[PDB]
């Protein structure tokens with residue numbers, strides 16, 4: 001139940017059935033540079049640096065929060 | 079929020095709905111009281127859009 | 128003000144009752160029917176709006192409950208579990224009132 005306000009919801013709803021989110025078979029792979037982000041306001045060339053910041057842990061597991069529906073919305077999603 | 083291939087980023091004090099959801103193809107038939115996921119009726123006070 | 132009647136207030140098994148709304152107002156945002164004396168949405172049954180003319184269901188929609196434009200709720204098969212209280216929610220200008228409660232019995 002995110003938020004606090006009751007709204008005119010123009011979709012169907014049903015608390016029929018829910019599951020755990022499908023924790024994906026893919027794991028976070030950083031060897032292709034995915035997961036990183038460029039340093040602001042600097043350029044390095046032909047080098048290798050030990051930097052820091054905020055980053056994903058390698059080898060952990062993703063999550064699929066992309067719920068889906070056609071016209072009804074599960075109440076136990078929230 | 080992606081809309082029309084641009085990003086509608088807005089760090090803004092929205093009164094977020096209790097049953098939020100977006101749509102691929104939303105349509106409102108001129109009904110100005112409907113909100114998809116937030117029902118502010120005033121301009122919400124914020125810093126960037 | 129708004130008044131709600133069960134016709135009949137005592138219904139036999141598997142028959143029809145009409146949750147007849149009287150003196151409902153006009154410029155409503157939406158309305159929905161609520162099982163029990165609660166306003167948590169998992170007891171909301173069916174939600175129909177006046178200004179876009181679409182109806183949508185809740186979690187407790189057993190499938191045999193017809194919602195009308197005058198706010199009335201028509202039952203098809205009265206079950207023994209459906210004895211109890213029912214509350215009719217109305218909303219206007221992002222403000223709400225839950226002051227329409229009704230209770231019947233089955234024999």
Ligand SMILES: *[C@@H]1O[C@H](CO)[C@@H](O)[C@H](O)[C@H]1NC(C)=O
Pocket residue numbers: 081082084086127
């Ligand atoms: C940004 O893009 C949206 C498209 O949904 C448009 O409505 C809006 O006017 C654009 N400009 C600003 C300043 O938000």
Ligand SMILES: *[C@@H]1O[C@H](CO)[C@@H](O)[C@H](O)[C@H]1NC(C)=O
Pocket residue numbers: 180181182194195196
């Ligand atoms: C209300 O919903 C039912 C399906 O649950 C549908 O058959 C009926 O036509 C709807 N009422 C109106 C007035 O559209």
